[PDB]
Design a protein around this ligand. Structure first.
Ligand SMILES: [Mg+2]
Ligand SMILES: [Mg+2]
Ligand SMILES: [Mg+2]
Length: 403
């Protein structure tokens, strides 16, 4: 037959639009019955475009979504869970690495919010030569990580042991999360209730405060973290995997190391990018949406999507590492075993709101308020009282979603 469907994505850069354009041409050649239209919309405009086209019923059939925004559309019942589950069933539930399907799970835990295609990770990076010269082995817990930051802290030379995020932004909530989660604390419990005033969270908030005693003074934003790790003022830094292209361009790839904040468990933060399928479409469009999403999970197709950001974007599909576009990539080859060590950390992906097989959509309102990040900002930058800040934050949190 014939049907035209739309693929909405966040690639406004002309370099990545050409990769997607080449992918659509290949898919259309192998499926002359289907036509795929590009809808490139930047990430700052993504939300306002989606809710507009949804109100008018003009939602694109396939949409690239992060796992946090996929919960927003699923909360509004804009996602076809049946078509998404059918696509994952076709690709194979075990074609994805361990720990990737769990984060994109729905609140009731019955289905998924999208078919994952990539993910970037965040953790504590370090210069191997600095730690190896000082006799500091790779930390295996909080205490060893905090000690290493204390030996490497030298405010007399404007040198700091670790670059730790402290600004009122989503990154600080991200950085604090892998310490809160490694300590066994989540914003939500198994029943979906918000509860952050707990001994496990207070312990992680106290350690983040202690680790913040070895960072740059003031409010540290994403740019200050990157510059501090790049210029040598901080041998350790909490950053996303996007530090890999920066190190490949202006640094030393063989000098980059990675440690996972560990205490009660091992916690690495990750944002999973998925190809979701929307509701309100004809049966011909839905089956064509399943076909394109499944076709995108093939070896060369998923690798072509992941390699639009070499090093930073990591393959959640197990078929990519065997593809030639990945194995001979200069950025991948430069970092040696680090991209695979990062891939091996997928089972340790822990994010706020994901409690077991359930990721609660209510975390979107928590992150959108900045309450967690402002709490860390007040405890570290403001030196405000630990317990009153935690309890007050829990009060606004309950006040937010009980209103
Ligand atoms: Mg600052
Ligand atoms: Mg390591
Ligand atoms: Mg339609």
């Amino acid at each position: 037959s014939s049907v035209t469907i739309e693929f909405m994505h966040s690639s406004v850069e002309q370099e990545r639009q050409a990769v997607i354009t080449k992918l659509i041409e290949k898919f259309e050649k192998e499926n002359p019955s289907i036509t795929v239209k590009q809808v490139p919309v930047e990430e700052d405009a993504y939300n306002t475009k989606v809710i507009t086209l949804a109100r008018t019923g003009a939602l694109p059939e396939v949409i690239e979504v992060s796992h946090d925004y996929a919960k927003v559309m699923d909360k509004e019942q804009l996602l076809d869970r049946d078509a998404i589950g059918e696509a994952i069933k076709a690709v194979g539930e075990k074609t994805f690495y361990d720990g990737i399907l769990r984060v994109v799970r729905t609140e009731d835990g019955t289905a998924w919010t999208g078919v994952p295609i990539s993910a970037w990770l965040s953790g504590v990076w370090y210069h191997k030569d600095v730690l190896a010269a000082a006799g500091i082995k790779e930390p295996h817990n909080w205490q060893q990580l905090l000690k290493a930051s204390q030996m490497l802290n030298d405010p007399a030379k404007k040198h700091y042991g670790i670059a730790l995020p402290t600004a009122e932004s989503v990154m600080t909530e991200q950085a604090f999360s892998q310490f809160a989660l490694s300590g066994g604390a989540n914003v939500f419990d198994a029943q979906g209730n918000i509860q952050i005033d707990t001994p496990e969270m207070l312990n992680a908030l106290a350690f983040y405060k202690e680790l913040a005693k070895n960072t740059m003074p003031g409010s540290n934003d994403v740019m200050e973290i990157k510059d501090a790790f790049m210029n040598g003022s901080a041998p350790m830094a909490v950053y996303s995997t996007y530090i890999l292209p920066a190190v490949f361009k202006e640094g030393d790839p063989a000098n980059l190391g990675f440690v996972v904040p560990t205490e009660k468990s091992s916690a690495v933060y990750g944002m999973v990018t998925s190809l979701t399928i929307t509701t309100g479409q004809t049966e011909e469009e839905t089956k064509a949406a399943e076909k394109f999403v499944t076709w995108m999970e093939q070896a060369q197709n998923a690798s072509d999507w992941v390699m639009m950001s070499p090093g930073a974007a990591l393959p959640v599909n197990k078929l990519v590492v065997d593809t030639e576009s990945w194995k001979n990539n200069e950025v991948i080859k430069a970092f040696g075993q680090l991209p695979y060590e990062l891939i091996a950390q997928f089972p340790n992906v822990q994010v706020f709101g994901a409690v077991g097989d359930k990721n609660f959509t209510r975390m979107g309102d928590v992150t959108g308020s900045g309450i967690i990040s402002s709490m860390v900002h007040n405890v570290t930058v403001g030196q405000q009282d630990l317990n009153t800040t935690l309890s007050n934050s829990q009060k606004r949190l309950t006040d937010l979603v009980s209103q």
